[PDB]
Amino acid sequence: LEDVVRAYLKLAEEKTEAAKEESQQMVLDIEDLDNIQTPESVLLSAVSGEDTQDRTDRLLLTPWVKFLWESYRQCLDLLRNNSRVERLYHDIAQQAFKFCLQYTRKAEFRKLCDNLRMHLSQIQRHHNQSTAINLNNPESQSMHLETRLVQLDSAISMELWQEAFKAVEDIHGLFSLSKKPPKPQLMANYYNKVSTVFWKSGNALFHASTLHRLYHLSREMRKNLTQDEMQRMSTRVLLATLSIPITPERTDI
Amino acid sequence: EITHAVVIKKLNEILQARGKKGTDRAAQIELLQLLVQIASENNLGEGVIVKIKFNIIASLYDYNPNLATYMKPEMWQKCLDCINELMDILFANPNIFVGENILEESENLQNVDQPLRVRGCILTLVERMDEEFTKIMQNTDPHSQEYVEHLKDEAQVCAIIERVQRYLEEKGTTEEICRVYLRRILHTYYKFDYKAHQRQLTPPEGSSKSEQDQAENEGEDSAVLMERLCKYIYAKDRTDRIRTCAILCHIYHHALHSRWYQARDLMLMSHLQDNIQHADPPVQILYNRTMVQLGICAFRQGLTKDAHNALLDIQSSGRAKELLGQGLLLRSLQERNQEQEKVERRRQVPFHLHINLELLECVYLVSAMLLEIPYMAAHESDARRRMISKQFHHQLRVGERQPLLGPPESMREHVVAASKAMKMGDWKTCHSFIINEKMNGKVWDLFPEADKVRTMLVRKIQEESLRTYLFTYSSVYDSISMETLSDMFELDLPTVHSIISKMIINEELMASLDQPTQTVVMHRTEPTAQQNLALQLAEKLGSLVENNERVFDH
RNA sequence: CGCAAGACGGACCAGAGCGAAAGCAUUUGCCAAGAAUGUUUUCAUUAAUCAAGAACGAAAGUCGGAGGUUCGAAGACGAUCAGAUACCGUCGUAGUUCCGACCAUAAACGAUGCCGACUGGCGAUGCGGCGGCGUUAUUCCCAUGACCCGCCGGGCAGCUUC
């Protein structure tokens, strides 16, 4: 299954690669090909239209994209929304994220929704020879970090935000139902990432707070991580300061 | 091959089995072609092939298994070639060639009914063909492209309808042709600033002075001409369903090509609010459609008020969707049933007649913005009793109550973004959404008058932001360098005079205003007043409701 | 393995269809004909049955031409039998086939005249029309196709009973 389904999604990815280039070099140059003045009927629809490249890339690329998306949705999803072992799921998720980033973004809503639903079915399902949750932080931590990085960057990439919010909510829920273990690495990683992604959107207040949180994490990780670097400490203190002095009052209009 | 009797009778016997289950249905066309390419004689005519030519371009119709469909573009071009040839035969010639006897040659079709609506069987065709093109511009799809050769057939049918216009012997000139004219104005009406100002702003002393250039400058007149003309050629029918249809298309021309005054006049004269009730459900869509473009050209002339009231009636509802024939059965829960919403899909509408709804949205939400942010600035300086729901107040409120907004990435959020900037009273925040979201969003990029409407937006923001600033700050003042306000909000003293003058008169402020010295002296207190006037109101509200509780009781 | 001649339309082919009866199965086209059903079209009693008289009418047979593979009266042989001019085996003429004239007969049998009215039940089948919860074909979608259910005509038949 690993060899077959990897080779399937790999064959579909190359058909879309060829389909874009094809449409984006031959047909895209056929489009705006030649002059660019007076379209006879191109100016009239200029009151509610777009460019010629999107207008004819929809004819020769949208197919590939759509197909790939559908496959990813029904593939691992409609064939492996859980089960026992076999990660590959991480790779699938990564691919989906990349696709969303590149092609259409709406896919994020669908993919995200599906993921959440699946997580709910299991977390609030528990009824099958599936994964015997208990102390198996391997797969757990794995999927966790995976979705995290994927969600974080994803949202903080296509200018999404609700998606990022959903991701954070999910992570919080996991921590709640996954607080039975002490705590492994990655923690610091995610913390820093989030604080950063925040910074602006929210006030440098909560952002600076998260920054100080990551700074404190650098202490624990230090005693356990061990980082012999002064520059690091300097940068940390700097980030702390800023995030702090920034706003002395909010304008609650 | 022998005197136009065998020929004619076989005409009969081919135009007979026209309908039934055994048609072959395409080699009747073929066989009409095999009485023409083997029709190579003389006088007799050039002459009477015209009519056969009708019937046979009518083969170039009827092949088609029904009325819902759209016409293999090769079939489409063959149609064209036929019709075009059957302009040839019917300029050159003039005898009218299913009647008016001459010397003879060579007929008989006086004897059936009238030469003449079988003469008038060329307008029929061409209207049909308009309609077939229209059926085209539905099944081809959409942002992209078969699309352009089809647009080109569209050019060519423009051609045809133009042609079907100058000719007119009709019965002579005026007195019914008007419907050619109708088609022609249906293909003049939804066109553009650039082609109402190729006469005026493709430079009129830089353009050619050649009869042809006048035919161009008259071509821009020629539709708003046929208004003045063909009112009487209809002028003459009172039928509410064509009256209420025609005038809605006329009000369109005005506001876009010319004065919004004439547009404002024409609907206000007509009073078609009553008349649309008598009208059938296409003209309902026209009524909605015309209301759009007037609230548009309200905002383009720069009037917040009229653009508000115009675009209000649409934005009370979420039906512009279903009115433009786009609505699902479920897109909330409301929009049943299946077989009935298809009527809208069959009747409505080409893609080249649409407008962006985010445009319509933003243009409405921005018009209201300049009215309501001073209004609420005034209100929260305790002028509140004028607080009105189900308005831009609500539409701003739903977007306001997001805990989580950082940078705006939706057109709603860009309106919310500029709204917050207007509250703070910094010009700066207006410019954000007016530049960036209008590039996103291409709210800006659909008008040559965005250049104008920029200036109209800007100075209003600078004046009303000054006003929102003043509604709060005027407790803090003891006096004002009025010169500062001019410099700071980027305004000039003549206007800032007139502004501050209007303000202190009508907003009923307790400022004393030295206009020659350019000074205000105010000293209007008190910060505790915000509580005191509030409990004074809370008090005063007591007795007033209480008198109703009395008058009910007794 | 190839060629020629003449004959013949298997299985599919059925208490199935069409024709007044005798009869009628390879493909495709042409020529004229007919039943049933549909119809708020036309005519207005124009009908039913039939001496005289008329058309068609299996197979065999006769006359004149063509053809003659196959089968085969007659005939010549071989057996079986007391006898065996037979049943059975071999050969074989007329005939069997086609074209043009005759012949008018059959268990030409449903052994059951034709036209009309009335009087049980039930399930099928061929054809037309109409009504319908649905699957199914295609172009993605009520063109008209196939399958399912019910109803109305007229047709070949069957089952059931104080």
For A102, A147, A203, B185, the CA distances from A154, given in Å and listed in that order, are 11, 10, 22, 51
Cβ neighbours of residue B39 under 8 Å, at least 6 residues apart?
A: B7, B49
Coil, helix or strand at residue B117: coil
For A174, A186, A187, A216, the CA distances from A181, given in Å and listed in that order, are 12, 14, 13, 20
Backbone angles phi, psi at B480, to 5 degrees: -150, 130
User: Nearest Cα to A33, choosing from A6, A13, A56, A59?
Assistant: A56
Beta strands B512-514 and B519-521 are antiparallel
User: Nearest Cα to B289, choosing from B359, B246, B353?
Assistant: B353
User: Nearest Cα to B128, choosing from B79, B195, B199?
Assistant: B79
Long-range CB contacts (within 8 A, 24+) of B507-513: B507/B378, B509/B474, B511/B474
Question: Phi/psi zone of residue B96: left (φ > 0), alpha (ψ -120 to 50 degrees), beta?
Answer: beta
> To 10 degrees, what angle do helices B222-230 and B240-257 make?
150
The per-residue DSSP string of A36-73 comes to -S--SSTTGGGGS---HHHHHHHHHTHHHHHHHHHHHI
Cβ atoms of residues B272 and B249 within 8 Å: no
What is the side-by-side order of every strand in the sheet holding B512-514? B479-481, B519-521, B512-514
Cβ neighbours of residue B127 under 8 Å, at least 6 residues apart?
A: B179, B183
- Interface mutation vs chain B, best among A47, A62, A198, most B CBs within 10 Å: A47
> To 10 degrees, what angle do helices B178-186 and B148-166 make?
150
Residue A59 to residue B144, Cβ atoms within 8 A: yes
Residues of chain A in Cβ contact (below 8 Å) with chain B: 40-41, 43-50, 54-56, 58-59, 159-162, 165, 200-202, 251, 253
Cβ neighbours of residue B357 under 8 Å, at least 6 residues apart?
A: B320, B321
Cβ atoms of residues B393 and B387 within 8 Å: yes
Residue B256: half-sphere exposure toward Cβ, Cα within 13 Å:
23
Contacts of B356 in chain A (CB under 8 A): 48
Inform me whether the C-beta atom of residue B551 falls under 8 Å from chain A C-beta atoms.
no
Residue B145 to residue A54, Cβ atoms within 8 A: no
Retrieve residue A113's tokens: 């929704």
Cβ atoms of residues B11 and B38 within 8 Å: no
Alpha helices in B137-239 (DSSP H): 148-166, 178-186, 212-219, 222-230
Distance CA B332, CA B322 (A): 12
Distance CA B145, CA B148 (A): 7
Distance CA B430, CA B414 (A): 10
Cβ neighbours of residue B447 under 8 Å, at least 6 residues apart?
A: B193, B300, B453
Distance CA B159, CA A87 (A): 65
Alpha helices in A158-226 (DSSP H): 162-177, 187-198, 204-225
Retrieve residue B155's tokens: 């050019």
Distance CA A82, CA A5 (A): 16
Across the interface, of B145, B356, B424, the residue whose CB is closest to A48 is: B356
User: Nearest Cα to B467, choosing from B499, B491, B498, B494?
Assistant: B499
Sign of CA dihedral A74, A78, A82, A84: negative
For A81, B9, B225, B398, B417, the CA distances from A130, given in Å and listed in that order, are 11, 84, 79, 43, 48
Check residue B35 and report its DSSP letter. T
Retrieve residue B501's tokens: 């003058």
- Interface mutation vs chain A, best among B136, B137, B140, B144, most A CBs within 10 Å: B144
Distance CA B256, CA B193 (A): 6
Retrieve residue B252's tokens: 């369109």
The dihedral formed by the CA atoms of B143, B245, B185 and B118, expressed in degrees to the nearest 10: 110
User: Nearest Cα to B106, choosing from B36, B48, B41?
Assistant: B48
Contacts of B423 in chain A (CB under 8 A): 253
Check residue B411 and report its DSSP letter. H
Distance CA B204, CA B217 (A): 10
> Which DSSP helix (H) or strand (E) runs through B130?
helix B123-136
Resolution in units of Å = 3.6
Cβ atoms of residues B353 and B366 within 8 Å: no
For B115, B123, B166, B176, B230, the CA distances from B172, given in Å and listed in that order, are 15, 15, 11, 9, 15
User: Nearest Cα to B404, choosing from A245, A163, A211, A248?
Assistant: A163
Distance from CA of B94 to the nearest CA of A (A): 34
Residue A253 to residue B356, Cβ atoms within 8 A: no
| CB environment B369-381: b (16+ within 10 A), e (fewer) | bbbbbbbbbbeeb
Distance CA B70, CA B68 (A): 7
- The CA-based angle B406-B410-B411, given to 5 degrees, is 120
Distance CA A121, CA A11 (A): 31
Distance CA A92, CA A97 (A): 9
Alpha-carbon Rg for chain B, nearest whole angstrom, is: 32
Quickly count: other Cβ atoms within 10 Å of residue A154's Cβ.
23
Distance CA B518, CA B487 (A): 13
Alpha helices in B380-492 (DSSP H): 392-400, 411-424, 428-432, 438-439, 450-473, 482-488
SS3 for B445-457 is HHCCCHHHHHHHH
Place of tokens 């489009």: A31
User: Nearest Cα to B196, choosing from B223, B233, B157?
Assistant: B223
> Which DSSP helix (H) or strand (E) runs through B359?
helix B357-379
Give the CA B158 to C1' C23 distance in Å.
Answer: 71
Distance CA A50, CA A45 (A): 9
Quickly count: other Cβ atoms within 10 Å of residue A55's Cβ.
19
